[PDB]
Design an enzyme around this catalytic site. Structure first.
Site, short mmCIF file in Angstrom:
data_model
loop_
_atom_site.label_atom_id
_atom_site.label_comp_id
_atom_site.label_asym_id
_atom_site.label_seq_id
_atom_site.Cartn_x
_atom_site.Cartn_y
_atom_site.Cartn_z
N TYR A 76 -43.41 -10.12 -0.52
CA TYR A 76 -44.50 -10.39 -1.66
C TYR A 76 -45.10 -11.65 -1.38
CZ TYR A 76 -43.29 -6.68 -5.09
OH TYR A 76 -43.16 -5.58 -5.47
N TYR A 119 -49.34 -4.56 -8.51
CA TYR A 119 -50.64 -3.93 -8.34
C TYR A 119 -51.13 -3.41 -9.70
CZ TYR A 119 -49.78 -3.12 -3.41
OH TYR A 119 -49.64 -3.21 -1.88
N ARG A 176 -43.86 -3.78 5.80
CA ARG A 176 -42.81 -3.10 5.25
C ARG A 176 -42.78 -1.71 6.07
NH1 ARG A 176 -45.06 -4.90 -0.22
NH2 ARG A 176 -43.97 -6.72 -0.89
#
Length: 260
Positions: A76, A119, A176
């Site tokens: 993150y 998001y 990722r």
């Protein structure tokens, strides 16, 4: 001092971007925890603060630079520095709040956004969903500028939110998912900006669930199928880790692996 990885959009190529994402992955985890050929990020539990973050310094053709801070436990983006100001997303808990006090300590002006960096929140603030926000080298070049000029009043909040959405997908999501890295490589190769299709969006939405399903699986087999989408938006089920090996590059740590 936290590890720094440099990338520039200035003259970016498939190769330079590939090198960058590989470097990010290498700094996010040791790769000592691999399950069904998929590396796992370090466990948050017991992770010392001196190993908690990596820094991604982004430069652009406009000769501007910003530094993103990434949490190694989940990749993150927790905040950024541009010049003598740093901004952090609203922390989810006291541990994360304490953790971010260890970032950009030399910077003069440090702020916490009243909003989180997910998001859902960023899309609301941008006034656009991810499905309508263009990604590519051009969007990233522009995102770096937008982040740079925020502290001096050069960037409206919806543009800032959009710019975060761009950075997060092109850095964190690409780290990722090999698949998302591939999608970004394609955009860079042809220098053609485009919004992410349902195959990208559904993967991003499902990263946590996929990580858990893989780690809790019976020898790779999911107890419950996970629905993803194809490029055309049609739905398909994932029943097993096998098909995800070329798709997922990093998982969030959920539990210890079962006996081998």
């Amino acid at each position: 001092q936290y590890p720094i990885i440099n990338f520039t959009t200035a003259g970016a190529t498939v190769q330079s971007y590939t090198n960058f994402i590989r470097a990010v992955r290498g700094r996010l985890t040791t790769g000592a925890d691999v399950r069904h050929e998929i590396p796992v990020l370090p466990n948050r539990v017991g992770l010392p603060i001196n190993q908690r973050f990596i820094l991604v310094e982004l430069s652009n053709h406009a000769e501007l630079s910003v530094t993103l801070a990434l949490d190694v436990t989940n990749a993150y983006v927790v905040g950024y520095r541009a010049g003598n100001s740093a901004y952090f997303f609203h922390p989810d808990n006291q541990e994360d709040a304490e953790a971010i006090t260890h970032l950009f300590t030399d910077v003069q002006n440090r702020y916490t956004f009243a909003f989180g960096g997910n998001y859902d929140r960023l899309e609301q603030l941008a006034g656009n969903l991810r499905e309508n926000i263009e990604l590519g080298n051009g969007p990233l070049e522009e995102a770096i500028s937008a982040l740079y000029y925020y502290s001096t009043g050069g960037t409206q909040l919806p543009t800032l939110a959009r710019s975060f959405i761009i950075c997060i997908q092109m850095i964190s999501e690409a780290a990722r998912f090999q698949y998302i890295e591939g999608e970004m490589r394609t955009r860079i190769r042809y220098n053609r900006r485009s919004a992410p299709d349902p195959s990208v969006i559904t993967l991003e939405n499902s990263w946590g669930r996929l990580s858990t399903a893989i780690q809790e699986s019976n020898q790779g087999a999911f107890a419950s199928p996970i629905q993803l989408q194809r490029r055309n938006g049609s739905k398909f089920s994932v029943y097993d880790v096998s098909i995800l090996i070329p798709i997922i590059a990093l998982m969030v740590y959920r539990c210890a692996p079962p006996p081998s």
